[PDB]
């Protein structure tokens, strides 16, 4: 053969899956909370972000199985759940920085171990997460400048929508 | 100037072309044999795979000429030709593992010699070949579990098609 | 004039017609038997093959009349009728080998007697029959490898069709 | 069970098939002769009539197999082949009267033996053949009244068609 | 090289061209005469036949030039021009029998001299001319049976067309 | 049976395949070189010609397998690779003259051994190659008359295409 | 946090922006000069190339801001402006080789400093610039072979366009 992956690479893929499953759930819960609170526009964005992380998790599961490893979907990473709009954005941002650090370490490990296709998967995920970090930092900058109440209003729909 | 490539990089590109031309021909012959044997569905897939390797060969020829090297289309790599369905899949799989090993070595050589665009071409080919390896391993797993005769039936068309 | 054909050429055309009429009827009966037996997909193919031999018969009748000969539709060649799927394929194949031998001899006779248009007609029929031979040999090869029961299943439709 | 037909009913069905196969061939040859002679309109009608008798033969083969009998397509009834337009119509007409007499006897036999579905098939064929008899008698009446040469002209196409 | 044809093959191609140019002009004149005489339907057919011979002439010119010979369009074969409908058909038929004999001889010469592509061209022309012969023999047969005056009427249009 | 071909016919088919595979690769390389040199119009034509020879190779592979022989795709005929436009055309032309000679010999061998369907295949290939020869001789004639630099210009695209 | 980029990475991004802004302006001026000179086809290609470099500059500005650096659009790299068609192509080519060298150095610096997303941006730019280098080398090769005046004619439109 053989497609049998390096144990350490499969470990890194399973670490990424743990983080991705955490993000799926954190974003889904934040979507539902934001909706209940009346911030329907931000809630919609949060739901879309959860679905994007579902696609990441699927890519990771697929790669693990190709490498003849066993994907772990039994546990999810610790959730950070906000209690207002600013805390939701901050919680998501911290989660994104954690994933960024993980994928940077993982791409280096894959490179060193000669799994260039897995390295490329971590490079794709890294670019995606930096995109999300940039989005969140922008929202938090906007919220700081126009104030939390105006940011909340901006991200809520009128009663007839 | 100059676009003049490293001799060792052009060597690696010509090695890949030798392997790609072998794969084109092996898949084309396997398509025609599988068709004659009655496995029309698998024959169709094999024909598509040959055409995909034709595109790889074209990308390699193009890159060699950009680097001011001379592409060698005079010889093709040794063919592995099966005499039944399981042997056809095994023969293709061995050929794919050879190409995988070659492209892994070649991407490292391009990286070391500072040809990052050629390195990227080998990275693209590597991902493509791992995809094909995964397809073939799956077929061979299915064939093992349902039996060669059921796998053959699954991959044959009825007389009126 | 004249279009008056060589007697021996008309004889060869009438021999071909005798075989073609036999083939029409053998394939038509095999279509109806295969359908009664449940092999509806192979039955459909058999009906199509009968219709193709009807077109051959018509071309031969047309040529005989052009040569001012008299087409004989009073008798048909001996039918080989199978009692199961494998025997139907074998019976058809023997009939095709007979027609192949006849048309090879006939094209040589036409060439020798200077009737190049009749020779071309036998050449066209010969290529058609070699195609059929190829199809049938492939089916018999498939039947042998996957087994008669799987070949039967492959060539039967579900009850709601 | 059982669908096993009365031997005498299967005999009558096989007699009808013998006559139908004769009619197919007589009409097909008459089509080709009439065409060669220039009577393209009548030739077209004759070709259509041959195809109609092909459908009758198919209905008979189908019924024989349902009754668990063996259809005989090895022999065809004696052909009556005309040498001019009036003789072609007369030859066809005699063949139609023979089939009419046969189907009348056969429907009575099926009735007496309690095969009402086969009786109904002979009743359908009988009505069809009386239709054809009526068509032919009309043509022969027209030919008598306007003369054979005008009837021939009426049933020929101009050179550009 | 080279495509330089055998002189004798070019001679045979030029002989065919001579006959084809004669046929173009004979059919064109017969079209115009038949039209003047009132036989507009036969006239239309004659014009179509002239155009078909124009295509034959073009194929021959093309082949001669490929073989590096010089096509001769300076002279045309002796015209046979009829003075009534029956004579027009007879004149055309004699011209077709001449071309048939010429092309049979020419295909044999090409075969003997190893020019199989030119042989194939003569085979194609031969089949075309035998078709025309067939058409003309059929018209003359029809004319004989229904009489020249009815044949004329059949092939004339009413005054408002 | 049987479809088992004459060994000498299979040898001739394998010789044709060897030449066809050489032509595929020569035309493909010439396409890529001409494109690199700026002659994009001639390059497009060269790519089309390579694809046409791919179809020839496929027809030969198909016939070999029908005759129960083993197609050889392991080796390709010696490539003639030009270093400027005139040399590319001359190289292709020499390759076409080689294939023409081979197919003329092969059609004679097939005829002599009574394989008229394989003979017809060589006849089809022969006509195709004579067409190509014609095209190339015309280009070389044009290049000679208008000069290589104008021929090059004629066959290059402007920079915005 | 933090997205704060390495100072040396931001430096490399600002060096690339300086070069990109130079290229935008050089290609824009070359477009306008080529148009004034009558080489409308090449002028159109030059305008398209300027717009492509505008997109590169935008990607670089975006990345700098993501890294919390300050993009410098106050200065542009030294322009190389040609005074005839060959000099325009040469000037552009030299500019492309400079950018190629810069992006090769920059991707290595980003790799070493662990900014893999910035490294990927330099890899994308590098591939783009090698594409342009290949285009320009081809044009200069064509110009050399057919002559500057024919190359100019090829790349000019007629007066009515
Ligand atoms: C809290 C747990 C989850 C919730 C509440 C959730 C919710 C949803 C919903 C509602 C949809 C469909 C959107 C719609 O039609 O309205 C969806 C789609 C999807 N869930 N999902 C969860 C976890 C996961 C996990 C663990 C995976 C594993 C990979 C996953 C994979 C996907 C994918 C790939 C799609 C989109 C299908 C496609 O377009 O290809 N979801 N998730
Ligand atoms: C055994 C030798 C080969 C055979 C039998 C073969 C057969 C074919 C056929 C039949 C097609 C067209 C598919 C169709 O229209 O039915 C095709 C397409 C193609 N062959 N090919 C061979 C070798 C090569 C080689 C050496 C190259 C070099 C790069 C190549 C490049 C291509 C490309 C790029 C296409 C698709 C064109 C496009 O969609 O861009 N084939 N090959
Ligand atoms: C002299 C012998 C025969 C000749 C020359 C002949 C000729 C033809 C031709 C040429 C067609 C297709 C019409 C077209 O597409 O141009 C046809 C159709 C057909 N032949 N046929 C012959 C005998 C038979 C026999 C013995 C049967 C047995 C039942 C048969 C059954 C049919 C049927 C059912 C069709 C029409 C298919 C449909 O529409 O369902 N032909 N015959
Ligand atoms: C000499 C200076 C420049 C000139 C003369 C120029 C000219 C133009 C023109 C005329 C267009 C529109 C094309 C049309 O509609 O006809 C355009 C588009 C554009 N300029 N541009 C210059 C510098 C820049 C710079 C410094 C940037 C910075 C990134 C830039 C970014 C863009 C982009 C991104 C587009 C296309 C918009 C899109 O399709 O997304 N141009 N430039
Ligand atoms: Cl990399
Ligand atoms: Cl009743
Ligand atoms: Cl021949
Ligand atoms: Cl010029
Ligand atoms: Fe993610
Ligand atoms: Fe989901
Ligand atoms: Fe490949
Ligand atoms: Fe190909
Ligand atoms: Fe046949
Ligand atoms: Fe009937
Ligand atoms: Fe029929
Ligand atoms: Fe002619
Ligand atoms: Fe060829
Ligand atoms: Fe750029
Ligand atoms: Fe702009
Ligand atoms: Mg394994
Ligand atoms: Mg609430
Ligand atoms: Mg998959
Ligand atoms: Mg150089
Ligand atoms: Mg076979
Ligand atoms: Mg290119
Ligand atoms: Mg039954
Ligand atoms: Mg006809
Ligand atoms: Mg029973
Ligand atoms: Mg006749
Ligand atoms: Mg039924
Ligand atoms: Mg007058
Ligand atoms: Mg031509
Ligand atoms: Mg170049
Ligand atoms: Mg086939
Ligand atoms: Mg011969
Ligand atoms: Mg910060
Ligand atoms: Mg001016
Ligand atoms: Mg953005
Ligand atoms: Na407000
Ligand atoms: Na099964
Ligand atoms: Na009349």
PDB file of C-alpha atoms in Angstrom, chain C residues 20-147:
ATOM      1  CA  UNK C  20     -31.245 -13.414 -43.075  1.00  0.00           C
ATOM      2  CA  UNK C  21     -34.855 -14.628 -43.027  1.00  0.00           C
ATOM      3  CA  UNK C  22     -33.786 -17.439 -40.641  1.00  0.00           C
ATOM      4  CA  UNK C  23     -32.097 -14.873 -38.391  1.00  0.00           C
ATOM      5  CA  UNK C  24     -35.156 -12.583 -38.366  1.00  0.00           C
ATOM      6  CA  UNK C  25     -37.333 -15.466 -37.183  1.00  0.00           C
ATOM      7  CA  UNK C  26     -34.835 -16.951 -34.722  1.00  0.00           C
ATOM      8  CA  UNK C  27     -34.325 -13.544 -33.070  1.00  0.00           C
ATOM      9  CA  UNK C  28     -38.046 -12.820 -33.032  1.00  0.00           C
ATOM     10  CA  UNK C  29     -38.870 -16.152 -31.372  1.00  0.00           C
ATOM     11  CA  UNK C  30     -35.974 -15.713 -28.933  1.00  0.00           C
ATOM     12  CA  UNK C  31     -37.377 -12.226 -28.094  1.00  0.00           C
ATOM     13  CA  UNK C  32     -40.799 -13.711 -27.275  1.00  0.00           C
ATOM     14  CA  UNK C  33     -39.353 -16.674 -25.305  1.00  0.00           C
ATOM     15  CA  UNK C  34     -36.944 -14.484 -23.291  1.00  0.00           C
ATOM     16  CA  UNK C  35     -39.833 -12.133 -22.469  1.00  0.00           C
ATOM     17  CA  UNK C  36     -42.018 -15.120 -21.294  1.00  0.00           C
ATOM     18  CA  UNK C  37     -39.088 -16.306 -19.166  1.00  0.00           C
ATOM     19  CA  UNK C  38     -38.730 -12.883 -17.452  1.00  0.00           C
ATOM     20  CA  UNK C  39     -35.502 -11.659 -19.134  1.00  0.00           C
ATOM     21  CA  UNK C  40     -37.115  -8.493 -20.421  1.00  0.00           C
ATOM     22  CA  UNK C  41     -33.851  -6.543 -20.994  1.00  0.00           C
ATOM     23  CA  UNK C  42     -32.219  -9.259 -23.087  1.00  0.00           C
ATOM     24  CA  UNK C  43     -35.616  -9.750 -24.817  1.00  0.00           C
ATOM     25  CA  UNK C  44     -35.623  -6.077 -25.884  1.00  0.00           C
ATOM     26  CA  UNK C  45     -32.136  -6.465 -27.344  1.00  0.00           C
ATOM     27  CA  UNK C  46     -33.203  -9.595 -29.227  1.00  0.00           C
ATOM     28  CA  UNK C  47     -36.175  -7.756 -30.771  1.00  0.00           C
ATOM     29  CA  UNK C  48     -33.859  -4.949 -31.922  1.00  0.00           C
ATOM     30  CA  UNK C  49     -31.505  -7.510 -33.514  1.00  0.00           C
ATOM     31  CA  UNK C  50     -34.409  -9.147 -35.411  1.00  0.00           C
ATOM     32  CA  UNK C  51     -35.371  -5.728 -36.832  1.00  0.00           C
ATOM     33  CA  UNK C  52     -31.733  -5.108 -37.915  1.00  0.00           C
ATOM     34  CA  UNK C  53     -31.785  -8.443 -39.819  1.00  0.00           C
ATOM     35  CA  UNK C  54     -35.112  -7.357 -41.410  1.00  0.00           C
ATOM     36  CA  UNK C  55     -33.196  -4.375 -42.821  1.00  0.00           C
ATOM     37  CA  UNK C  56     -30.467  -6.730 -44.179  1.00  0.00           C
ATOM     38  CA  UNK C  57     -33.122  -8.880 -45.859  1.00  0.00           C
ATOM     39  CA  UNK C  58     -34.614  -5.771 -47.473  1.00  0.00           C
ATOM     40  CA  UNK C  59     -31.229  -4.616 -48.850  1.00  0.00           C
ATOM     41  CA  UNK C  60     -30.653  -8.096 -50.373  1.00  0.00           C
ATOM     42  CA  UNK C  61     -34.165  -8.238 -51.933  1.00  0.00           C
ATOM     43  CA  UNK C  62     -33.554  -4.738 -53.412  1.00  0.00           C
ATOM     44  CA  UNK C  63     -30.185  -5.787 -54.916  1.00  0.00           C
ATOM     45  CA  UNK C  64     -31.575  -9.049 -56.396  1.00  0.00           C
ATOM     46  CA  UNK C  65     -34.319  -7.132 -58.196  1.00  0.00           C
ATOM     47  CA  UNK C  66     -31.855  -4.536 -59.485  1.00  0.00           C
ATOM     48  CA  UNK C  67     -29.850  -7.404 -61.000  1.00  0.00           C
ATOM     49  CA  UNK C  68     -33.083  -8.712 -62.607  1.00  0.00           C
ATOM     50  CA  UNK C  69     -33.111 -11.854 -60.470  1.00  0.00           C
ATOM     51  CA  UNK C  70     -35.968 -13.319 -58.476  1.00  0.00           C
ATOM     52  CA  UNK C  71     -35.770 -13.031 -54.663  1.00  0.00           C
ATOM     53  CA  UNK C  72     -36.738 -16.183 -52.808  1.00  0.00           C
ATOM     54  CA  UNK C  73     -38.795 -15.538 -49.651  1.00  0.00           C
ATOM     55  CA  UNK C  74     -40.470 -18.957 -49.666  1.00  0.00           C
ATOM     56  CA  UNK C  75     -38.014 -20.692 -47.342  1.00  0.00           C
ATOM     57  CA  UNK C  76     -35.957 -19.690 -44.289  1.00  0.00           C
ATOM     58  CA  UNK C  77     -32.731 -21.179 -42.925  1.00  0.00           C
ATOM     59  CA  UNK C  78     -32.858 -23.798 -40.106  1.00  0.00           C
ATOM     60  CA  UNK C  79     -33.646 -22.157 -36.767  1.00  0.00           C
ATOM     61  CA  UNK C  80     -31.574 -22.793 -33.646  1.00  0.00           C
ATOM     62  CA  UNK C  81     -33.898 -22.197 -30.696  1.00  0.00           C
ATOM     63  CA  UNK C  82     -32.484 -22.133 -27.148  1.00  0.00           C
ATOM     64  CA  UNK C  83     -34.230 -23.384 -24.011  1.00  0.00           C
ATOM     65  CA  UNK C  84     -32.432 -21.089 -21.550  1.00  0.00           C
ATOM     66  CA  UNK C  85     -30.518 -17.813 -21.684  1.00  0.00           C
ATOM     67  CA  UNK C  86     -27.050 -19.294 -22.281  1.00  0.00           C
ATOM     68  CA  UNK C  87     -28.455 -21.507 -25.100  1.00  0.00           C
ATOM     69  CA  UNK C  88     -30.220 -18.533 -26.729  1.00  0.00           C
ATOM     70  CA  UNK C  89     -26.913 -16.638 -26.857  1.00  0.00           C
ATOM     71  CA  UNK C  90     -25.016 -19.710 -28.164  1.00  0.00           C
ATOM     72  CA  UNK C  91     -27.700 -20.371 -30.835  1.00  0.00           C
ATOM     73  CA  UNK C  92     -27.593 -16.759 -32.060  1.00  0.00           C
ATOM     74  CA  UNK C  93     -23.766 -16.858 -32.080  1.00  0.00           C
ATOM     75  CA  UNK C  94     -23.651 -20.028 -34.259  1.00  0.00           C
ATOM     76  CA  UNK C  95     -26.115 -18.357 -36.676  1.00  0.00           C
ATOM     77  CA  UNK C  96     -23.875 -15.280 -36.843  1.00  0.00           C
ATOM     78  CA  UNK C  97     -20.765 -17.376 -37.555  1.00  0.00           C
ATOM     79  CA  UNK C  98     -22.656 -19.098 -40.406  1.00  0.00           C
ATOM     80  CA  UNK C  99     -23.621 -15.747 -41.946  1.00  0.00           C
ATOM     81  CA  UNK C 100     -20.049 -14.465 -41.522  1.00  0.00           C
ATOM     82  CA  UNK C 101     -18.655 -17.462 -43.470  1.00  0.00           C
ATOM     83  CA  UNK C 102     -21.288 -17.072 -46.164  1.00  0.00           C
ATOM     84  CA  UNK C 103     -20.648 -13.352 -46.661  1.00  0.00           C
ATOM     85  CA  UNK C 104     -16.875 -13.768 -46.771  1.00  0.00           C
ATOM     86  CA  UNK C 105     -17.315 -16.387 -49.559  1.00  0.00           C
ATOM     87  CA  UNK C 106     -19.882 -14.183 -51.314  1.00  0.00           C
ATOM     88  CA  UNK C 107     -17.766 -11.034 -51.332  1.00  0.00           C
ATOM     89  CA  UNK C 108     -14.934 -13.035 -53.002  1.00  0.00           C
ATOM     90  CA  UNK C 109     -17.264 -14.432 -55.641  1.00  0.00           C
ATOM     91  CA  UNK C 110     -18.631 -10.919 -56.402  1.00  0.00           C
ATOM     92  CA  UNK C 111     -15.075  -9.565 -56.632  1.00  0.00           C
ATOM     93  CA  UNK C 112     -14.053 -12.372 -58.996  1.00  0.00           C
ATOM     94  CA  UNK C 113     -17.078 -11.862 -61.246  1.00  0.00           C
ATOM     95  CA  UNK C 114     -16.654  -8.066 -61.424  1.00  0.00           C
ATOM     96  CA  UNK C 115     -19.770  -7.052 -59.477  1.00  0.00           C
ATOM     97  CA  UNK C 116     -18.106  -4.541 -57.167  1.00  0.00           C
ATOM     98  CA  UNK C 117     -21.378  -2.984 -55.941  1.00  0.00           C
ATOM     99  CA  UNK C 118     -22.688  -6.390 -54.781  1.00  0.00           C
ATOM    100  CA  UNK C 119     -19.246  -7.045 -53.287  1.00  0.00           C
ATOM    101  CA  UNK C 120     -19.600  -3.791 -51.304  1.00  0.00           C
ATOM    102  CA  UNK C 121     -23.004  -4.935 -50.041  1.00  0.00           C
ATOM    103  CA  UNK C 122     -21.507  -8.193 -48.741  1.00  0.00           C
ATOM    104  CA  UNK C 123     -18.650  -6.185 -47.156  1.00  0.00           C
ATOM    105  CA  UNK C 124     -21.236  -4.012 -45.325  1.00  0.00           C
ATOM    106  CA  UNK C 125     -23.138  -7.094 -44.104  1.00  0.00           C
ATOM    107  CA  UNK C 126     -19.893  -8.774 -43.040  1.00  0.00           C
ATOM    108  CA  UNK C 127     -18.878  -5.801 -40.856  1.00  0.00           C
ATOM    109  CA  UNK C 128     -22.398  -5.787 -39.314  1.00  0.00           C
ATOM    110  CA  UNK C 129     -22.276  -9.504 -38.487  1.00  0.00           C
ATOM    111  CA  UNK C 130     -18.776  -9.250 -36.963  1.00  0.00           C
ATOM    112  CA  UNK C 131     -20.205  -6.563 -34.689  1.00  0.00           C
ATOM    113  CA  UNK C 132     -22.914  -8.872 -33.574  1.00  0.00           C
ATOM    114  CA  UNK C 133     -20.490 -11.651 -32.999  1.00  0.00           C
ATOM    115  CA  UNK C 134     -18.520  -9.347 -30.836  1.00  0.00           C
ATOM    116  CA  UNK C 135     -21.542  -8.388 -28.775  1.00  0.00           C
ATOM    117  CA  UNK C 136     -22.575 -12.033 -28.268  1.00  0.00           C
ATOM    118  CA  UNK C 137     -19.064 -13.243 -27.365  1.00  0.00           C
ATOM    119  CA  UNK C 138     -18.888 -10.462 -24.780  1.00  0.00           C
ATOM    120  CA  UNK C 139     -22.264 -11.506 -23.267  1.00  0.00           C
ATOM    121  CA  UNK C 140     -21.165 -15.135 -23.103  1.00  0.00           C
ATOM    122  CA  UNK C 141     -17.891 -14.084 -21.463  1.00  0.00           C
ATOM    123  CA  UNK C 142     -19.800 -12.008 -18.890  1.00  0.00           C
ATOM    124  CA  UNK C 143     -22.284 -14.837 -18.241  1.00  0.00           C
ATOM    125  CA  UNK C 144     -19.354 -17.233 -17.633  1.00  0.00           C
ATOM    126  CA  UNK C 145     -17.596 -14.867 -15.170  1.00  0.00           C
ATOM    127  CA  UNK C 146     -20.568 -13.627 -13.055  1.00  0.00           C
ATOM    128  CA  UNK C 147     -22.571 -16.877 -13.482  1.00  0.00           C
TER     129      UNK C 147
END
